[PDB]
């Protein structure tokens, strides 16, 4: 004999998708003009005794961030110059002044020679051409804009709140005991990488491992470290920018000094200790835990493809993953198509001098094996962006509520 009663004012919220706009810190790199500045007083209201179950593999914030990144890339690339006239036969020859590698190619435009990379051009049957000149309308990046990742916060619009999890013991899924309410988010860095997370957030307590369903050896496995493994990586070549007018096209001139492949090292002891912590973690969830290298696939998944000061390195990473329970020869190419699209491709104009970038390594992407061997993998940019957005969930507040109490009105 109970009766419904409405209780307007109750603190009830429901998960609900929305369109987070943006938040940046740099002055209107990225296009950044659609990004509002961020100097608020972030109201970190820590809720009490609130158990709100989270998820990371079903967020619709992640796809929103991926769409924003793609849109920013396209908008920044738009005012640049197309490379349609470059679709001509190239007269290529080897250079001697990782033995062959670079190739010097002359082309006739109305007859000048420039430098190209072996993995950047394909011969036709001596005579070479671009890797994909007619299939994809290649466009070269504008020289003034770089690719350094500017922090990009996501704030909820009016009516929505973002729920942070401060619990250290957290694998993404399942209930989250400690929760807090916020309007903005921390300084997520839109870095592009594979098999190594490069400058992402550091997890507390011991090293953390997570996946959709571990048992299923298809779901990507994300590992977040505790102590970053320092990696300093250089391109020891005095590259010479060369400007050719058709509309100003940029290319590589004759190399100043000796020609040496771009390579870089990793602190062996620190890497070994971090990998030991990781392999200790994987024993949960006593058999052999191997570590092979990337098994096949295109260049964007075989190597640790990543940007550095406007130059894109596709780095051999077999040496980092061979310990069964360090120098890495980093190949270089300048043609690039991002986010696994077709019809769009960048040229990455060369940067003069020698470049050296010093960065942390914070996360690892590993895949199980059938039957173990946790060889690295990845390339699904969403998996990369789920290593910082794993403690956020847009939520809409719904004050109205109904309860079964004993009342009779009139």
């Amino acid at each position: 004999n109970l009766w419904v009663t409405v209780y307007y004012g109750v603190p009830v919220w429901k998960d609900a998708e929305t369109t987070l706009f943006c938040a940046s810190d740099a002055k209107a790199v990225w296009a950044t003009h659609a990004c509002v500045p961020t100097d608020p007083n972030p109201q970190e209201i820590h809720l009490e005794n609130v158990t709100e179950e989270f998820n990371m593999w079903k967020n619709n914030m992640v796809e929103q961030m991926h769409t924003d990144i793609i849109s920013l890339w396209d908008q920044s690339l738009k005012p640049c110059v197309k490379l349609t006239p470059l679709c001509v036969t190239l007269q290529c020859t080897n250079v001697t002044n990782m033995r062959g590698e670079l190739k010097n190619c002359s082309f006739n435009m109305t007859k000048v020679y420039s430098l190209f990379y072996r993995l950047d051009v394909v011969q036709i049957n001596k005579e070479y051409r671009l890797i994909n000149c007619n299939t994809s309308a290649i466009t070269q990046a504008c020289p003034k804009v770089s690719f350094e990742p500017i922090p990009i916060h996501y704030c909820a619009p009016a009516g929505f709140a973002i729920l942070k999890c401060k619990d250290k013991k957290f694998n993404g899924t399942g209930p989250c005991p400690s929760v807090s309410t916020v309007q903005c988010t921390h300084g997520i860095k839109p870095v592009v990488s594979t098999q190594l997370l490069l400058n992402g957030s550091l997890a507390e307590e011991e090293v953390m491992i997570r996946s959709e369903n571990i048992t299923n050896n298809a779901k990507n496995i994300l590992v977040q470290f505790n102590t970053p493994v320092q990696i300093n990586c250089t391109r020891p070549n005095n590259n010479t920018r060369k400007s050719i007018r058709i509309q100003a096209f940029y290319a590589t001139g004759d190399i100043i000094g000796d020609i040496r492949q771009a390579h870089c090292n990793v602190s062996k002891a620190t890497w070994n200790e971090t990998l030991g912590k990781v392999v200790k973690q994987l024993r949960k969830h006593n058999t052999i835990i191997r570590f092979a290298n990337s098994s096949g696939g295109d260049l964007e998944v075989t190597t640790h493809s990543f940007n550095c000061g406007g130059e894109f390195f596709y780095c051999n990473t077999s040496g980092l993953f061979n310990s069964t329970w360090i120098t890495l020869p980093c190949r270089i190419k300048q043609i690039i198509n991002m986010w696994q699209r077709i019809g769009q491709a960048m040229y990455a104009p060369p940067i003069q001098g020698v470049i050296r970038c010093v960065s942390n390594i914070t996360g690892l992407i590993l895949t199980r094996d059938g039957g173990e061997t946790f060889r690295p993998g990845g390339g699904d940019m969403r998996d990369n962006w789920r290593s910082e957005l794993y403690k956020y969930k847009v939520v809409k507040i719904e004050p109205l509520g109904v309860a079964p109490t004993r009342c009779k009105r009139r």
Partner: antibody, heavy 123, light 111 residues
Framework: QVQLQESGPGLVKPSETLSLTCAVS????????WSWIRQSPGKGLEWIGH????????DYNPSLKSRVTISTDTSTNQFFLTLSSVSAADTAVYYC????????????????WGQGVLVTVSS | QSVLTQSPSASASLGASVKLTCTLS???????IAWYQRQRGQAPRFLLR???????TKVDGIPDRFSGSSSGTERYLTISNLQSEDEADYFC?????????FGGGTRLSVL
């Protein structure tokens, strides 16, 4: 439990637009990639295109980039293929499939497919 | 270039073992592939992913009798304990760039 169903004209004349509608049941709310594929008789399959259900970033096969258009209707949760300038060489069995969201060792697969619909061009 | 090859047709008796060979091109020396079966007149089914090292990803609901292996630029799909349902068209597909490469289709019949 995701099911794909396809429908549309069975016979089409040359030199007009062929429209095919594929509805989905059980799919995720957003973030899915709906792909359109076709197989001509006697020949191997080839990918036509796909759409990101959340953003709307279309993508098409380069050999058919200037003739096709794929759109979505989130309200009824369907998606449409419109292939223009159809000829007698475009007769095929057409499938609407759902793209993978795992990227295991450098592959995107099509976990779920439709029953396939015949499309022919004749005099 | 980039192209997949395979036998146009192969057959075996019921209860025997059937071998399907998927051949990658020279530039595809190590790419992972995925197997697809299509019984005549029904929706093609996802079978499994399989790379050059021999790793394979079983799919929920697929019979365990399906198996796979790798050897260089050759990918082997092994089937045992056949019946009339296994008669179908099989093909291997791969993703190099954002363009897909499918096989030419192989008809397998059981007698």
């Amino acid at each position: 439990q995701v099911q794909l169903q396809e429908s549309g004209p069975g016979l089409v004349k040359p030199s007009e637009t062929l429209s095919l509608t594929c509805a989905v049941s059980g799919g995720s709310i957003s973030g899915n990639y709906w792909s359109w594929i076709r197989q001509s008789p006697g020949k191997g399959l080839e990918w036509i295109g796909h759409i990101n259900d959340y953003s709307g970033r279309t993508d098409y096969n380069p050999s058919l980039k200037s003739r096709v258009t794929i759109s979505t209707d989130t309200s009824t949760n369907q998606f449409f293929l419109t292939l223009s300038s159809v000829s007698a060489a475009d007769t095929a069995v057409y499938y609407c499939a759902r793209r993978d969201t795992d990227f295991w060792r450098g592959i995107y697969v099509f976990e779920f497919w439709g029953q396939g619909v015949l499309v022919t061009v004749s005099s | 270039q980039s192209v997949l090859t395979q036998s146009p047709s192969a057959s075996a008796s019921l209860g025997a073992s059937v071998k399907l060979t998927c051949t990658l091109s020279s530039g595809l020396r190590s790419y992972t592939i995925a197997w697809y079966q299509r019984q005549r007149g029904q929706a093609p089914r996802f079978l499994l992913r399989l790379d050059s090292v021999g790793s394979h990803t079983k799919v929920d609901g697929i019979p365990d009798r399906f198996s796979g292996s790798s050897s260089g630029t050759e990918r082997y799909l092994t089937i045992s304990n056949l019946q009339s349902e296994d008669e179908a068209d099989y093909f291997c597909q791969t993703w190099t760039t954002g363009i897909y490469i499918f096989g030419g289709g192989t008809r397998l019949s059981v007698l």
